[PDB]
Every structure is written in structure tokens, then in C-alpha cells.
Swiss-Prot record:
Protein name as it appears in the record: Lysine-specific histone demethylase 2
Top-level taxon: Eukaryota
GO molecular function, one term: histone demethylase activity
Organism: Homo sapiens
Top-level enzyme category: oxidoreductase
């Protein structure tokens, strides 16, 4: 840079492009008669640092009277119709003319190799190729010096055009996009729950990935693709397509390489990258997950993610998820569970005749891309889709006219809309309870326009209100007007809502196969003061490890059953208290026959229009628990103020109320006695004491995030109440565990 005023002695570079490192640009395409081979040309053309072509081969295709113009102009037409990106002699050489490169099969060699001008590269070739194919010892011939060049840092920046894969496995799924925008060349069956790519311009599908844009986390891990995401996108999309093509078996770099097909040396960069990005996606849980296991000497991450030690508190969905993930990564993992069984708020009763009923979760709310859907695939497990019909039954007997509900649903929704319009102005400090805000708005839509409602119309309204109480997990006077539906504005899991007939506990028992799980051992103290962390069970037993993951229910953090040393942030404590620990309660009844068949008519559920507003949560809905319509088990939900009105009376007293209600719903017929039954008491299961979280009034959705933030890279949190995007659910919990495993493994 200094002493270069003199044109006379400035440096002479043979390639015009600034920063090329080839001092002797040879030509790769003896395509004209007067190819300048290694000799002189008026201009060199830069493709990569080890790939150039001379001015005569440029003209041989670009000029009208020359005899390449045919082949090139045929290409140029297809390109502009099938692609968004501009067609140039440069792009043409890259797409059409560059020789293909291939690695040797035998473990000794593994040398890269140029192929001949006519050999077209295919997966079978790459899968098997050894040195010399269409005697001697080819496997000693020196590797081309250009090959060592590509794994060098700066080499990709000197590539002039992004690589576009050919015949990508991801090409079916991506047909709605211009191939260039997706990293495939312009010149060219699975599971229905698995739609993994957004279609152009579509939004609001959970867990869908944009095929043509890098996510933010992807950009932070691979900053080298800020300039041009194309190579990354193509490789990432390919990896996805491969995994949803077969998810019962671990996707390795070896299965990916045969499908990376590009002209040029770029292919060497591509098979090098594919390994790094496949490992990034295995950490984040994008692939090689669910209930896949491995087991035993073979792991899912390079040995340098090993010799970290983790202790996980809680054997619930979130805990177990994190544990499968870590154990599959090759990390050393111990789970301590308080109770005498794994599963947590997942606990399936199998003692019923021919049916399994969940005391805990049993429903899947949106199957498209749901981890639970995936896991049902790997396990060969069928899940039943709910039907639309659900007529609401008055006591005693008459099925409410659909046009009544259809109009009471309008008004109920219109009330929420006025609430949500009133929010826009209010801060956290001005939050009021949702139920108070509803009641008020109602009373002055009545006192306003004198249009008053029938007694039934009023009861049907209460039925809708009852549903919110089930959704929120508490009486509406506790839930935030400002944030009750905070999570609905993020993308939601599309698709079927389904009953999980075998019950969540089969996917939880499988998650937990062959893991170090200590039961009957509740944690009492977590000391992260020293170098590693020191956890102590109530009885005295000490456990130590490098990092710790707590997956404990929100209610147990709120009433500090774990001593933190140092103690938790004040900002973290306000968040933990910002949320409400919701309850509902379940009752399941086994009858000698399906007494409801004549009235209900094979529907999946039926509704119970509540007599007084006071009792709106007392058996609001009954669920047919055999989709085969063969057995007779009904299950029902106790929500809102009804949950409190039942904490005092014993099981057989709540049974009797439910039977009173069923006898009133079927007034004009007989109903038999239950043979078998249960009533859940989650409220008072010492080690859970809740059902799911919600935003207490005064809170905000942001609290889930604060609870999720780790402490000093040593203490991590997962669980249903750490997941702001997907709260409450078994799938939301599972995800959070996978999320923290990703963090820990890093
Ligand atoms: C009646 C009911 C119905 C539900 N319905 C559905 C549904 O239909 N669909 C759905 O998706 N979800 C449903 N849910 C919610 C769902 O079950 C939870 O979101 C999910 O189970 C949360 O799992 P988790 O891993 O966050 O914690 P949990 O499943 O709550 O497990 C936490 C574990 O922590 C352990 N623990 C607590 N303290 C300690 C300690 N000090 N030391 C060691 N271990 C400790 C507990 O023993 C427990 O095993 C329902 C829940 C209930 C109770
Ligand atoms: Cl150039
Ligand atoms: Cl294959
Ligand atoms: Na520490
Ligand atoms: Zn150059
Ligand atoms: Zn040439
Ligand atoms: Zn070889």
C-alpha cells in the first residue's frame, strides 16, 4: 500500500479479480480451438480461486457467430423462465461446464479427485467411487493442490457465485419457489403431519421454517453467510427433507453427501459444511430427535461435547426430553425425581377395560409439526382426530337449538373484543381481572341497549365463559385481562386436534428408556456457589455435577421447596410470582354399556349447559373415551370455582354429583351405575400441586422468558411454565427441555 505512486512498479496480477490467489490461472474448459491453456489471454475470468476460464472460451459461448452460442442460448432461455437470478457466461460455466469432483471411498485414501468432461455425477457414483473408474495403483497419485486450498478460511469469499444444488431431495417440497431462491438450479409421499417448510408468503404455522431466509440463531452460528445465505439454505433444506423422509433412524453426514451435487470445487466446500450444519441442527433439536435412541457406542455429536456433567431435577415431559437429548449427545446425565414414578403431570390409568384414560394430559392441540406427532410416527402409534359435532345438553334433556349457541358465541366473542380493544392503552400497572372486565362490559351493553336475554341464552353464555376457565386453569377473576391470550399472537400448531388414545405415557416411558433415573429422591438444596454444583436430596444424599437443569412445576418454585445458594434473582422471583398455578380436575367413569349412544349419536363429546352461573365449571363437558365406539368410559373436567367447591368433599361424593348431573342430562331415560371410577387430586399432590400455568392479573407473557433465562451458565430451567411461545402443554414442555439441552451442550 505504500510506495505505489509509481505505476511503473505496482504489482502485476494475472487474474483481474481483486484478491485471487492463483498466480497461474490455467483454463478449465478447452472449449474453443484457441483455448489459452496455461498461456496468455487478454482477460481471465474468475469463478473461484482455483477455477478460471480464458477470453476465447468466453467468446466461444457469448458471441453469435461462434459455435457454442447454440448450447449457451438454449440454456439462457430455460434459465430466465425458471429463475429469478441473472444468466451470465459465468453462471453458465458454473452450472454447466465445470467438472464434478468426488472423494475416494477407501478409508486410507479419502482423496478428492476431478472427473472427466463427460462423466455426469450421480448419488451411486459418489456413494461408491474409488480412484480410477468409468490394473495400477491410482490411490498414491498426489491430490490436486487446489483441494487443500478450499478448506482455507478466505476461500469462500473469493467464490463469485453461490452454488446451486442439482436434483435436491428437497425439490419436491419446494416446487412453489424459484429454485435459485432456495439454493437449487433453475435448470431441472411422506407423513401429513410433517409439513416442514412455509409456502411462499404464508405465516402463522408453528415450527415451519422459511426455506429461503436464514433464522437469527442460524445467522449467529454461521456469520460467514450474511453476505449470501444460498449455500447454507440449500444444505439446510436438504438435511430437513432427508430427516422427514426417514425419522426412525439417525441422519448422518454420510447419508447427506451423496445428495450434494454441484459442478465445481464448491462441492468440496459443501460436503465440508454439511457436517457442521448437520451438527448444529442436531443440537437445536431440529432433527435426530423425538424418541429415536442410540444406543450404544454410537453418539449424535462429536466427542468434544462430552465430559460435561448434568443433573436434571424432575422426570416430567420437559425433564425426560432434555435427558434423552443429552444422553443421545453423549453427555453424562442424571435425573432425580421426587415422586415414586416418572411422568409428572402425565399419568395414564390403564386399569380400565380395553381403554386407557389419562389422569394427566391426553389431548394434542394441533398436529402439524408437533413433536408429539413426530414421536407417534417413530413409535407406530395411532391418534384419533376429534369431530366437529358437539351439541350442548340442558338439564333435563333438551338439546339446545344450534342457532341459540351460534348467537351466544357471537356475543361472548364480541365481549372479548371490547376487552382486547381496551388493553391497547393499559400498562402492567393498570391491569384488571378478565372476569371483572367481562362482567362490567356485559352489564353496560345490557343497561345500554335494552335488549335483554332469555334465561337459557344466559346459561349458554355461561357455558362459553366456562370454557375460558378450563383454558386458563383458574377462575376468571384471577387471570390478566391484559395478557390472558398473550400466546395466541405467536404462530400456533396447525392441524388436527386429537385424542392420544394409547396415552402420552407411552411416549414418556419410551423417552425414559435406559436412563439413570433416581426415584423417591426429591431435591432440597442446589448449591452453585463453588466450582461445580451440589444438589442434596431431602434425606441427605448428595449429587454433584458441572451444570444443573430444574424442570420443577411453577407451584413448587413459588413456594420455594428448593433452596438456591446463592438465592434466585429478585427479578426472577417476581416473574415466578407473576404467573398463576392453575388447576383443573378430572373424573373418569366406567359404565356397563354406552347409555349415551341413542341421544348423542356417535359424537366425540357432549356439553352440559350449566344451571346457575355459580356452577359453570362442574362437569361442563363429557368425553367419549373410545373412538372405536365400542367401550363405555366417560371422562369429565372440573374447572374454575367448581374446583374449590370440591376440595373438601371426598371422591365418592364427587362421583355422586357427576351421576346426579348425568341423570339430569338424560332425564327421559335410564342410566346405569359406574363400575369403576377415579377423581384426580392434582391440587394436593405435594410434588406438583397444579395443572398448568396462566398469566395472573398484573403479569405479562414475558415472565415465561425470565423464568427460562439461565444463571451464570450453570443453572437452567425448563418446563411448561418456561415456554412463552407454547405454554401449558405437554408439547410446550417437551420443547423447553430440548431447548435447554441445546443450551447446555453448547
Ligand atoms: C389434569 C391435567 C390435564 C392436562 N391436560 C393437558 C392436555 O390435554 N394436553 C396437554 O398438552 N397438556 C395437558 N396438561 C398439562 C401438561 O400435563 C403439563 O404442561 C406438562 O405435563 C408439564 O410437564 P413438565 O415437564 O413442565 O413438569 P411436570 O410434568 O409437572 O413434572 C415435574 C416433575 O417435577 C418433580 N419434582 C417436583 N419437585 C421436585 C423436587 N424438589 N425434586 C425432584 N423432583 C421434583 C415432580 O415429581 C414431577 O414429576 C394437563 C395437566 C393436568 C394436571
Ligand atoms: Cl473476472
Ligand atoms: Cl440413499
Ligand atoms: Na458456579
Ligand atoms: Zn482469479
Ligand atoms: Zn480457454
Ligand atoms: Zn483413492
Amino acid at each position: 500500500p505504500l510506495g505505489s505512486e509509481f505505476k511503473g512498479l505496482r504489482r502485476r496480477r494475472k487474474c483481474e479479480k481483486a484478491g485471487c490467489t492463483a498466480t497461474c490461472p490455467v483454463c478449465f474448459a478447452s472449449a474453443s480451438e484457441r483455448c489459452a491453456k496455461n498461456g496468455y489471454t487478454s482477460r481471465w475470468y474468475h469463478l473461484s480461486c482455483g477455477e478460471h476460464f480464458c477470453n476465447e472460451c468466453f467468446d466461444h459461448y457469448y458471441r453469435s457467430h461462434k459455435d457454442g452460442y447454440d448450447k449457451y442460448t438454449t440454456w439462457k432461455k430455460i434459465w430466465t423462465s425458471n429463475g429469478k437470478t441473472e444468466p451470465s457466461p459465468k453462471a453458465f460455466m458454473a452450472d454447466q461446464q465445470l467438472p464434478y469432483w468426488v472423494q475416494c471411498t477407501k478409508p486410507e485414501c479419502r482423496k478428492w479427485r476431478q472427473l472427466t468432461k463427460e462423466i455426469q455425477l450421480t448419488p451411486q457414483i459418489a456413494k461408491t467411487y474409488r480412484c480410477g473408474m468409468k490394473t495400477s495403483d491410482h490411490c498414491s497419485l498426489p491430490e490436486d493442490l487446489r483441494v487443500l486450498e478450499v478448506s482455507n478460511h478466505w476461500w469462500y469469499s473469493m467464490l463469485i457465485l453461490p452454488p446451486l444444488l442439482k436434483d435436491s431431495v428437497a425439490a419436491p417440497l419446494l416446487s412453489a419457489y424459484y429454485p435459485d431462491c432456495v439454493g437449487m438450479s433453475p435448470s431441472c409421499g411422506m407423513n401429513r403431519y410433517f409439513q416442514p417448510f412455509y409456502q411462499p408468503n404464508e405465516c402463522g404455522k408453528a415450527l415451519c421454517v422459511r426455506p429461503d431466509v436464514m433464522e437469527l440463531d442460524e445467522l449467529y452460528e454461521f456469520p460467514e453467510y450474511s453476505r449470501d445465505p444460498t449455500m447454507y439454505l440449500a444444505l439446510r433444506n436438504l438435511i430437513l427433507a432427508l430427516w422427514y423422509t426417514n425419522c426412525k433412524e439417525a441422519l448422518t453426514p454420510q447419508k447427506c453427501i451423496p445428495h450434494i451435487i454441484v459442478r465445481g470445487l464448491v462441492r468440496i466446500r459443501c460436503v465440508q459444511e454439511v457436517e457442521r450444519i448437520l451438527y448444529f441442527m442436531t443440537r437445536k433439536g431440529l432433527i435426530n430427535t423425538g424418541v429415536l435412541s442410540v444406543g450404544a457406542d454410537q453418539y449424535l455429536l462429536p466427542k468434544d461435547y462430552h465430559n460435561k456433567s448434568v443433573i436434571i431435577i424432575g422426570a416430567g415431559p420437559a425433564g425426560l426430553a432434555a435427558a434423552r437429548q443429552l444422553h443421545n449427545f453423549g453427555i453424562k446425565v442424571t435425573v432425580l425425581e421426587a415422586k415414586d414414578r416418572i411422568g409428572g403431570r402425565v399419568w395414564d390409568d390403564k386399569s380400565f377395560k380395553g381403554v386407557t384414560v389419562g389422569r394427566g394430559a391426553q389431548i394434542v392441540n394441533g398436529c402439524i409439526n408437533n413433536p408429539v406427532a413426530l414421536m407417534c410416527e417413530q413409535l407406530g402409534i395411532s391418534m384419533h382426530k376429534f369431530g366437529e359435532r358437539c351439541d350442548l345438553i340442558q338439564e333435563g334433556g333438551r338439546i339446545t337449538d344450534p342457532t341459540i349457541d351460534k348467537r351466544m358465541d357471537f356475543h361472548f366473542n364480541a365481549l372479548l373484543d371490547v376487552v382486547s380493544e381496551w388493553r391497547k392503552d393499559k400498562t402492567q400497572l393498570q391491569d384488571v381481572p378478565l372476569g371483572e372486565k367481562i362482567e362490567e362490559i356485559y352489564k353496560a351493553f345490557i343497561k345500554e341497549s335494552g335488549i335483554q336475554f332469555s334465561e337459557l341464552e344466559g346459561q349458554v353464555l355461561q357455558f362459553h365463559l366456562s370454557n375460558l376457565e378450563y383454558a386458563c386453569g383458574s377462575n376468571l377473576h384471577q387471570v390478566s385481562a391484559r395478557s390472558w391470550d398473550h400466546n395466541e399472537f405467536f404462530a400456533q400448531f396447525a392441524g388436527d386436534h386429537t385424542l392420544l388414545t394409547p396415552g402420552y405415557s407411552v411416549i414418556i416411558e419410551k423417552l425414559a428408556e435406559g436412563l439413570d433415573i433416581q426415584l423417591k429422591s426429591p431435591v432440597q438444596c442446589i448449591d452453585y456457589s463453588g466450582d461445580e454444583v451440589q444438589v442434596t436430596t431431602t434425606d441427605g444424599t448428595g449429587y454433584s455435577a458441572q451444570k444443573v437443569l430444574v424442570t420443577v412445576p411453577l407451584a413448587l418454585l413459588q413456594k420455594g421447596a428448593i433452596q438456591f445458594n446463592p438465592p434466585l434473582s429478585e427479578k426472577k422471583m417476581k416473574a415466578i410470582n407473576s404467573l398463576g398455578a392453575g388447576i383443573i380436575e378430572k373424573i373418569a367413569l366406567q359404565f356397563p354399556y354406552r347409555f349415551w349412544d341413542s341421544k348423542v349419536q356417535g359424537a366425540d363429546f357432549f356439553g352440559h349447559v350449566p344451571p346457575s352461573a355459580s356452577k359453570r365449571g362442574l362437569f361442563a363437558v363429557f368425553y367419549d373415551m373410545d373412538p372405536q365406539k365400542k367401550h363405555s368410559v366417560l371422562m369429565s373436567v372440573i374447572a374454575g370455582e367448581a374446583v374449590a367447591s370440591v376440595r373438601t368433599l371426598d371422591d365418592k361424593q364427587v362421583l355422586q354429583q357427576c351421576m346426579a348431573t348425568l341423570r339430569e342430562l338424560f332425564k327421559e331415560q335410564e342410566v346405569p351405575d359406574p363400575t369403576k371410577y377415579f377423581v384426580t387430586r392434582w391440587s394436593t399432590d405435594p410434588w406438583i400441586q397444579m395443572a398448568y400455568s396462566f398469566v395472573k392479573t398484573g403479569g405479562s407473557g414475558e415472565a415465561y422468558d425470565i423464568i427460562a433465562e439461565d444463571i451464570q451458565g450453570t443453572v437452567f430451567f425448563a418446563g411448561e411454565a418456561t415456554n412463552r411461545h407454547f405454554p401449558q402443554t405437554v408439547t410446550g414442555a417437551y420443547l423447553s427441555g430440548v431447548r435447554e439441552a441445546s443450551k447446555i451442550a453448547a
